[PDB]
Amino acid sequence: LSLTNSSLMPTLNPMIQQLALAIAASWQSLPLKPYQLPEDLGYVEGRLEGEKLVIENRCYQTPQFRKMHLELAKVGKGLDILQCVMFPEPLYGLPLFGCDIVAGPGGVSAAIADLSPTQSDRQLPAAYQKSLAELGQPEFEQQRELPPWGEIFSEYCLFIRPSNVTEEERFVQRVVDFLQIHCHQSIVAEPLSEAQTLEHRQGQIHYCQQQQKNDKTRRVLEKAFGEAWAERYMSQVLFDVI
Ligand SMILES: C=CC1=C(C)/C(=C/c2[nH]c(/C=C3N=C(/C=C4\NC(=O)C(C)=C4C=C)C(C)=C\3CCC(=O)O)c(CCC(=O)O)c2C)NC1=O
């Protein structure tokens, strides 16, 4: 989580850099252990007939978080990506923190962050609703509508093209606030009942299945590694169904 050894970090979009730092800072003092990705994946790079894709994977776990995944990626010189999901241990019934940032030479094109539900009612737990409302509605000038598979995201989901530096910083601060709420609720959460654990597990499986419908992610992977590799990466590395 010291991103000091990262090859990609110094060359990434500035908003991406600040988000990577914020997420690493949030995780740094947790009771972390490594989480071994399939084939103990770390750094990976590939090219077929076009641009090369490079990805740095970092992945941890704690008793409350089954898998805490931070990816940084670059396609050629034209495209920077940050991806993060904290997959909850269903026993504690926490939502899914997720973030995806895509940037090119012109700036950030997509900034997405959410605390996504795992309950069957598609609602966040009550304490998250209370804490999230207290943050107030952020104003962003260029909102983007989620694609249909995006039904998985909560009403607090951000999906924007930041308009300027003030918006970039506003977005990063909102992600820090979501992380602050989430890490706090993780301390105050109890082991749930076996039926409740099952209901949360089902929500998390649904979230992964829907995230696999994201053809924007899939095409980037396919252009660098091919269809089979991208299928294995999406289903086994990014959005593994437990
Ligand atoms: C290797 C990893 C990886 C790649 C290659 C990737 C690519 C990627 N994801 C994108 C969109 C997106 N990405 C997401 C959301 C997420 N995606 C997530 O992995 C998570 C956790 C969420 C939400 C928390 C959404 C909702 C879109 C918009 C898709 C659309 O417009 O159809 C886009 C389009 C950006 C734009 O329209 O401006 C690209 C190129 N994203 C990645 O993470």
Side-chain angles (χ1 to χ4, degrees), residues 1 3-4 6-136 138-242:
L1 285 170
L3 302 166
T4 62
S6 172
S7 67
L8 293 184
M9 180 70 164
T11 77
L12 297 170
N13 170 274
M15 186 184 179
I16 283 172
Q17 296 180 323
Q18 288 291 358
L19 277 162
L21 190 74
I23 288 161
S26 166
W27 296 353
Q28 68 183 338
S29 294
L30 293 183
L32 304 174
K33 276 157 175 32
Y35 178 108
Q36 184 163 329
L37 291 172
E39 301 182 347
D40 199 19
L41 191 64
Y43 182 89
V44 63
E45 164 194 305
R47 191 202 295 274
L48 287 169
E49 295 301 337
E51 300 288 336
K52 179 190 56 251
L53 168 64
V54 174
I55 304 174
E56 286 176 9
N57 289 273
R58 289 167 173 85
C59 201
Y60 316 85
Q61 56 181 314
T62 72
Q64 288 72 29
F65 303 112
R66 172 183 78 82
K67 176 173 161 187
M68 297 157 65
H69 193 191
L70 171 67
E71 292 186 290
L72 302 173
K74 279 203 158 287
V75 184
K77 197 256 290 268
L79 186 80
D80 298 348
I81 295 158
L82 179 150
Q83 187 265 174
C84 178
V85 184
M86 297 170 71
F87 294 95
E89 283 288 351
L91 189 60
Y92 297 103
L94 299 177
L96 289 130
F97 172 79
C99 183
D100 211 49
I101 314 292
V102 179
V108 176
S109 67
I112 295 107
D114 193 33
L115 287 158
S116 304
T118 55
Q119 285 177 10
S120 68
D121 67 5
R122 305 171 71 245
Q123 295 234 308
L124 291 170
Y128 282 81
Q129 295 183 218
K130 185 167 211 176
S131 287
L132 289 165
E134 297 279 313
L135 299 175
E139 291 173 337
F140 287 114
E141 290 176 346
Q142 303 184 65
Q143 308 279 3
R144 293 182 68 178
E145 182 175 78
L146 289 162
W149 61 262
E151 58 82 17
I152 61 183
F153 302 119
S154 84
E155 65 176 3
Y156 291 97
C157 191
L158 305 178
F159 183 17
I160 66 172
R161 175 178 178 99
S163 289
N164 56 36
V165 163
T166 299
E167 292 195 349
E168 291 181 8
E169 295 185 340
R170 181 180 303 146
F171 179 98
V172 172
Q173 181 60 237
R174 191 52 43 93
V175 173
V176 166
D177 295 338
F178 282 3
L179 291 166
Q180 284 185 177
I181 293 167
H182 193 44
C183 283
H184 178 74
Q185 292 303 131
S186 74
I187 294 171
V188 302
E190 41 233 317
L192 292 164
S193 85
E194 200 173 347
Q196 291 168 326
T197 301
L198 176 64
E199 172 184 347
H200 295 283
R201 183 190 291 113
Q202 300 165 350
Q204 175 171 166
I205 287 165
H206 181 68
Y207 177 98
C208 288
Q209 287 172 340
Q210 293 286 77
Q211 286 274 18
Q212 288 180 221
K213 291 177 174 174
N214 184 163
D215 278 1
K216 305 300 204 285
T217 294
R218 186 172 305 263
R219 182 180 188 261
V220 168
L221 304 177
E222 288 183 336
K223 289 303 164 179
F225 289 98
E227 287 80 4
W229 190 105
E231 172 61 22
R232 176 174 190 277
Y233 199 82
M234 292 184 71
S235 70
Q236 296 170 58
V237 183
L238 295 178
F239 302 114
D240 57 312
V241 165
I242 68 197

